[PDB]
Design a protein around this ligand. Structure first.
Ligand SMILES: Cc1noc(C)c1-c1ccc(C(=O)N2[C@@H](c3ccccc3Cl)SC[C@H]2C(=O)O)cc1
Ligand SMILES: Cc1nc(N2C[C@@H](C)O[C@@H](C)C2)c2[nH]c(N)c(S(=O)(=O)c3ccccc3F)c2n1
Ligand SMILES: CC(C)CCC[C@@H](C)[C@H]1CC[C@H]2[C@@H]3CC=C4C[C@@H](O)CC[C@]4(C)[C@H]3CC[C@]12C
Ligand SMILES: CCCCCCCCCCCCCCCC(=O)O
Lengths: 56, 226, 231, 341, 262
């Protein structure tokens, strides 16, 4: 029983280990590009004028 | 506002009126929380959520035994932050599992959310504890070294006609729980210890009296008098 | 959901009569209720309205004082006490429902109707009244209000209803753009604040009927004379 | 047998750690240093949706970004109209012990759950004009902590029984179950594409699941306490967690590791809710210190404080168009926050 | 003179000690009212702070009256409005303190019933009753008056002012004083009879109740005693100017006992 209980954990760890991992720098650059590319469409980072604000 | 926005506002006002009526109806019942172990006997006290409704002195009580979820009483105890009190039923006859009960009471008392919720502690299975003390086969000194040097304090209240040994054991257990309770809280919430014989019919009366005291303390706090 | 109305017969002029609307199959206590009359060979005319809880009551200028609307929520029935019956009250009275909340479909279910025979308003204008249309082709009806029905909230409050011959009117569009549930996709609403158009992509034998456009924006509730579609 | 398996597991964990260290060529904090700071985010309470009579634990915005549903111990599930502060509906729940609520993407259905271990799906658009429970999804042995809609027919729920489940509303049975957590799952966030989702449990870990495959893809162990809330980056390639140790974290599904930690020495209380802005540059985060803090997701600099609540902030959500932020607290209030220009 | 200088010093000290404290208490009580399910005592406290603030706003007029020794005063309209407002706020505060005493006694003699059955409507009605009993009485008096700023009264006016003062004592103070004394005596005795399971600061509350009762009897006591003294002597007492100082001292001492006690 414990053998199958641990065997499952070992199989899950093997499945998680054998995955494609890109560099952290590339992921950070992608996140920065997404944040800087939708900045004008963000009504919280860049507040909209009170005319277009629906909660005025 | 338009004609269909005025009607929507009227509907919202009706919804708010119904909500206020429901809140007024539901504010008239005092909510509790049943806590304990498997052997505590929490179910047979008043004689996933298993709600229990009982009424004493024309006051409605709602005891919420949260069975089902089966681990530490954690991450769902935040919901029971507005309860009037917490009934912590503990089996005082089984010394082997006693330390687990004290640890559980310490964990419940020192909870970040139940920092204002008084605990009504019931020392269940009083007759079994008395029988165990009278038999002498099981000694509390084996599990609790501090019991060897413990004696019954003077000016006590041994109202039942019982042997000093049983009274000493009961007072030792109650003292342990009270010392756990008084190590924190700073008087914001207090623990009310009671003794239950598993056949007593006055548990509801004790709960009502303790809830009356708790509500009096809350009213005191509401007046900036405390 | 089914509204059945009874209590309308032959009444001498100057008399009194009461109409009863029996509501079943829906939460009558949460629905605002209207009364809509339709004179023979004439268009729909709004009569009275009572909201949920009987908070606000609005009557037409041609019935104020003579007629009164009341609702018996516990027994699910709507009533109109019609007094001083003039000979202009000789029309079928319908009992339409209307729940009002963001996204509601007001005027959704119209009652069956009861024929009573008495022995500052936005004027909607459905120019055409007769349209010879053959099944398969697209037809566009067209109303035109006096006041712009586009409130500041952004909602253009114009409703489009179709009455099949010998049937109670059924809402096709709510707030002009919206399409009512149980309504075929081909009917569509295109709108401008003073000009409103209803288009059916494919004609059907069921589709032919008289189409009526109403404004819910100011209290007096007007309906355009309507445009009968001839097969 | 058991000994070898316990070891093999340790060596696999060591291999995963070594791979993560190798892939960490740099860090997000040092990469995003030349960008101009967002400044000071000033937000004012546009609306105060009052009417709840007990502490709120959940809210969810509609896809139209105007209707929101809130859940509380009062026993009601109000469907607010945020623009005009109107109660469109007030659904009385059978169990007042509700800690979660959801709004369907189509807007036709809502869901609720809690200590009753049952997900109740309510049909808002009914011909009868009332809100009635269309389906009660039973089958979980623990309290429901979060429920999210995939579509009108599928809903994923997380419970305190260390499992997450994918339900079929039409049938009422778990289409797929998600096992692997060793603690009470306290939150879940569905990806923009709803093909993947993450769950934050009390074992201080976050697991990335697949709704179709039904197997965990990656795990993220960077916290020290229970993860009370989890969100998802708008692009779907990252997510943010909020734990009880007063620190948020930004994990990435591709680098498989935490990028930056959102912590301050002044804040010692745990995070209860986390949501990103529409662009993802801002990270709203509720806290038990009666305050909500806006974190610059690229620099970990607190860009503002949404201090308007008299009790613990429990729920928090940003509109789909990013036009507003609604925060619910235990003081039975619900405030809509919007920036001022 | 020495007496006028002392009165002015007491007035300015009272105003400076009260206005910021009363403003803070008003803000806190407004915030509490906006919170869900306010208690009647909270509405009564809000009304008491409003009455205290109204009294404090007209304190500068009493300061300039003391400075000018009644010799140099603004027109009759300003004096008649300010004296009416001051003397009506005094009795409004008296009746609101009487209402707060009733609420405190109710919340201790019947704890469970008070917690269950309380509604903000009771506090609103109590505040309205206090406001009526003070402002309407003062309005009736000022109306009968019209149909030194009320310092010197002739013999003809004396026969009208003295019985009205007797009424404004026996009906506007002796009833609130009696109910406050009874409520606080019962509060203290019930609290002393309570065997609090643990030490939850139930002696500090008894001390605070005794202090509040003493504050009531010291602030609103001599003022209304002066009415009986003047009626017996058939002449307005000369120490009314110094009794109203003690009466206004309560407007500054109220936030200390009701808000800053904790
Ligand atoms: C009536 C009448 N007719 O002629 C006369 C003279 C009166 C008359 C005037 C004054 C009083 C009188 O003693 N008051 C009233 C008062 C005083 C000053 C400003 C406003 C008001 Cl209301 S209220 C408080 C009381 C007080 O001074 O403490 C009694 C009777
Ligand atoms: C009928 C009534 N009158 C009240 N006031 C008192 C004064 C301050 O104002 C006037 C207008 C009347 C009440 N105030 C409060 N707190 C209550 S009660 O419902 O809580 C309650 C009910 C039964 C037993 C004890 C109680 F505490 C209550 N009830
Ligand atoms: C008597 C004079 C000095 C003061 C009069 C002020 C009174 C009449 C006013 C001021 C503020 C008002 C309160 C402010 C708002 C609330 C909260 C609501 O849930 C119940 C009514 C209640 C409690 C109002 C009752 C009336 C009120 C107390
Ligand atoms: C300034 C206002 C003074 C008026 C005083 C009226 C107080 C009314 C008190 C009624 C409360 C109910 C009394 C106890 C009821 C019971 O016996 O349980």
């Amino acid at each position: 029983a414990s053998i199958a209980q641990a065997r499952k954990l070992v199989e899950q760890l093997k499945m998680e280990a054998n995955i494609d991992r890109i560099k952290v720098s590339k992921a950070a650059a992608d996140l920065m590009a997404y944040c800087e590319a939708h900045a004008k469409e963000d009504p919280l980072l860049t507040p909209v004028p009170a005319s277009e604000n629906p909660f005025r | 506002v338009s004609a269909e926005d005025k009607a929507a506002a009227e509907r919202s006002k009706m919804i708010d009126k119904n909500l206020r009526e429901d809140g007024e109806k539901a504010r008239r019942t005092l909510r509790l929380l049943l806590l304990g172990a498997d052997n505590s006997g929490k179910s047979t006290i008043v004689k996933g959520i298993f709600e229990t409704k009982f009424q004493v002195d024309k006051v409605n009580f709602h005891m919420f035994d949260v069975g089902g979820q089966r681990d530490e009483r954690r991450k769902w105890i935040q919901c029971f932050n507005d309860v009037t009190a917490i009934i912590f039923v503990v089996d005082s006859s089984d010394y082997n599992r006693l330390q687990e009960a004290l640890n559980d009471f310490k964990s419940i008392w020192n909870n970040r959310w139940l920092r204002t919720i008084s605990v009504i502690l019931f020392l269940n299975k009083q007759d079994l504890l008395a029988e165990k003390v009278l038999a002498g086969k099981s000694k509390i000194e084996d599990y609790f070294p501090e019991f060897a040097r413990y004696t019954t304090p003077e000016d006590a209240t041994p109202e039942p006609g019982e042997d000093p040994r049983v009274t000493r054991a009961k007072y030792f257990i109650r003292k342990e729980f009270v010392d756990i309770s008084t190590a924190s809280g700073d008087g914001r919430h207090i623990c009310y210890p009671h003794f239950t014989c598993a056949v007593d019919t006055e548990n509801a009366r004790r709960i009502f009296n303790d809830c009356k005291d708790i509500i009096l303390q809350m009213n005191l706090r509401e007046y900036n008098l405390v | 959901v089914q509204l059945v109305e009874s209590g309308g017969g032959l009444v001498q002029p100057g008399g009194s009569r009461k109409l009863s609307c029996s509501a079943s199959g829906f939460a009558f206590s949460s629905f605002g209720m209207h009364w809509v009359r339709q004179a023979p060979e004439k268009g729909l005319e709004w009569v009275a309205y009572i909201s949920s809880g009987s908070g606000t009551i609005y009557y037409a200028d041609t019935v104020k004082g003579r007629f009164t609307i009341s609702r018996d929520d516990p027994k699910n029935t709507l009533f109109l006490q019609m007094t001083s019956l003039r000979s202009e009250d000789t029309a079928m009275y319908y009992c339409v429902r209307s729940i009002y909340y963001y996204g509601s479909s007001p005027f959704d279910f119209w009652g069956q109707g009861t024929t009573l025979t008495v022995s500052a308003d936005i004027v909607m204008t459905q120019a055409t009244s007769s349209v010879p249309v053959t099944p398969g082709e697209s037809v566009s009806i067209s109303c035109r209000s006096s006041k712009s029905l586009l409130h500041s909230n952004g909602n253009t409050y114009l409703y489009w209803f179709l009455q099949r011959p010998g049937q109670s009117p059924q809402l096709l569009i709510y707030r002009m753009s919206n399409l009512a549930s149980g309504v075929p996709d081909r009917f569509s609403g295109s709108g401008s604040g003073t000009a409103f158009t209803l288009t059916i992509s494919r004609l059907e034998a069921e589709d032919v009927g008289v189409y009526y456009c109403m404004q819910h924006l100011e209290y007096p509730l007007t309906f355009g004379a309507g445009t009968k579609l001839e097969l | 047998e058991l000994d070898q398996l316990r070891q093999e597991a340790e060596q696999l964990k060591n291999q995963i750690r070594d791979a993560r260290k190798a892939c960490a060529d740099a860090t997000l904090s040092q990469i995003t240093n030349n960008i101009d700071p967002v400044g000071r985010i000033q937000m004012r309470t546009r609306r105060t949706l009052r009417g709840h009579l007990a502490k709120i634990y959940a809210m969810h915005w509609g896809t139209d970004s105007r209707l929101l549903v809130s859940a509380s111990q009062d026993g009601k599930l109000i469907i607010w109209d945020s623009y005009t502060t109107n109660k469109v509906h007030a659904i009385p729940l059978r169990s007042s012990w509700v800690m979660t609520c959801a709004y369907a993407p189509s807007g036709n259905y809502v869901a609720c759950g809690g200590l009753d271990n049952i997900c109740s799906i309510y049909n808002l658009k009914t011909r009868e004009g009332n809100v009635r429970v269309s389906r009660e999804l039973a089958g979980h042995t623990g309290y429901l902590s979060c429920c999210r809609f995939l579509d009108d027919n599928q809903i994923v729920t997380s419970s305190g029984d260390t499992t997450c489940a994918l339900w079929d509303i039409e049938t009422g049975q778990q289409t797929t179950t998600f096992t692997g957590h060793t603690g009470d799952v306290m939150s879940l966030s569905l990806a923009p594409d709803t093909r993947l989702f993450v769950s934050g449990a009390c074992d201080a870990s976050a697991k990335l699941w697949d709704v179709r495959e039904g197997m965990c893809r990656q795990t993220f162990t960077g916290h020290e306490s229970d993860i009370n809330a989890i969100c998802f980056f708008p692009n779907g390639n990252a997510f943010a967690t909020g734990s009880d140790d007063a620190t948020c974290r930004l994990f990435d599904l591709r680098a498989d590791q935490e990028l930056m930690t959102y912590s301050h020495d002044n804040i010692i209380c745990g995070i209860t809710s986390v949501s990103f802005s529409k662009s993802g540059r801002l990270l709203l985060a509720g806290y038990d210190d009666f305050n909500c803090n806006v974190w610059d997701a690229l620099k970990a600099d607190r860009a503002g404080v949404l201090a308007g609540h008299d009790n613990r902030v429990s729920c928090l959500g940003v509109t789909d168009d990013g036009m507003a932020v609604a925060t619910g607290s235990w003081d039975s209030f619900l405030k809509i926050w919007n920036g001022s220009s | 003179d020495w007496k006028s200088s002392l009165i002015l010093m007491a007035y300015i000290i009272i105003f400076l000690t009260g206005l910021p404290a009363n403003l803070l208490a008003l803000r806190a009580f407004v915030g509490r009212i906006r919170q869900p399910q306010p208690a009647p005592v909270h509405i009564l406290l809000l009304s008491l702070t409003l009455a205290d603030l109204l009294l404090l706003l007209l304190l500068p007029f009493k300061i300039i009256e003391a400075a000018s020794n009644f010799r140099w005063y603004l027109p009759k309209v300003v004096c008649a409005l300010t004296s009416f407002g001051f003397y009506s706020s005094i009795y409004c505060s008296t009746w609101l303190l009487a209402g707060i005493s009733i609420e405190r006694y109710l919340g201790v003699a019947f704890p469970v019933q008070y917690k269950l059955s309380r509604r903000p409507l009771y506090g609103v009605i109590a505040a309205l009753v206090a406001w009526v009993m003070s402002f309407g009485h003062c309005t009736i008096v000022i109306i009968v008056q019209y149909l030194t700023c009320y310092e010197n009264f002739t013999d003809n006016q004396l026969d009208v002012v003295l019985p009205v003062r007797l009424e404004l004592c026996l009906v506007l103070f002796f009833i609130p004083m009696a109910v406050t004394i009874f409520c606080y005596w019962r509060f203290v005795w019930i609290m002393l009879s309570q065997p609090l399971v643990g030490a939850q600061r139930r002696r500090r509350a008894v001390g605070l109740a005794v202090v509040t009762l003493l504050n009531f009897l010291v602030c609103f006591g001599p003022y209304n005693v002066s009415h009986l003294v003047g009626y017996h002597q058939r002449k307005s007492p000369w120490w009314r100017s110094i009794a109203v100082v003690f009466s206004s001292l309560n407007a500054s001492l109220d936030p200390l006992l009701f808000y800053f006690s904790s």
